[PDB]
Design a protein around this ligand. Sequence first.
Ligand SMILES: Nc1nc2c(ncn2[C@@H]2O[C@H](COP(=O)(O)OP(=O)(O)NP(=O)(O)O)[C@@H](O)[C@H]2O)c(=O)[nH]1
Ligand SMILES: [Mg+2]
Ligand SMILES: [Zn+2]
Ligand SMILES: [Zn+2]
Length: 164
Amino acid sequence: GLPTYKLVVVGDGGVGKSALTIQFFQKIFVPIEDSYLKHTEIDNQWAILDVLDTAGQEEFSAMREQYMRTGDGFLIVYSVTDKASFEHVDRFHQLILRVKDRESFPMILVANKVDLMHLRKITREQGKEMATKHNIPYIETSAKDPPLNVDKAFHDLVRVIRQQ
Ligand SMILES: Nc1nc2c(ncn2[C@@H]2O[C@H](COP(=O)(O)OP(=O)(O)NP(=O)(O)O)[C@@H](O)[C@H]2O)c(=O)[nH]1
Ligand SMILES: [Mg+2]
Ligand SMILES: [Zn+2]
Ligand SMILES: [Zn+2]
């Protein structure tokens, strides 16, 4: 069948992992334990996306490493209003690279909640520096209607996987 990409959304609790996933699959924002399946055409090439919306809790090491092993690409999401979620980007990138036993792997740093500009604590420049440090692309998103770069984040991840 069509090429299948297993995309895994990781990040601290409350950063907007589910809101981004639901916006991407249902085009809704309302403030399902299975991974989500859809067809999508990216750069005139149809594909099947299999998207796992992870839980921001500590979870279990066995369950966590398992879905990291099966992922073809990862979105590392933080909230621009949450400093701790931004600092934990280093932990998510290192942990996924450790599981993969790789120096690099298709991932994109996602700075979510950029609509909350008066609560924003992580600047765009801080976000780009973080992405540059980890050698991954940077994109700013908002899952609140009207959504910002939600489709682009997932599609660009597939593009990275394709150009890997
Ligand atoms: N203003 C705004 N609120 C957002 C955005 N994304 C998520 N939220 C809000 O922030 C809260 C947490 O979002 P949620 O999607 O549950 O985050 P999560 O990363 O899945 N949390 P968990 O790890 O506990 O599953 C919700 O109230 C949601 O509506 C965004 O881009 N903008
Ligand atoms: Mg969630
Ligand atoms: Zn203002
Ligand atoms: Zn890193």
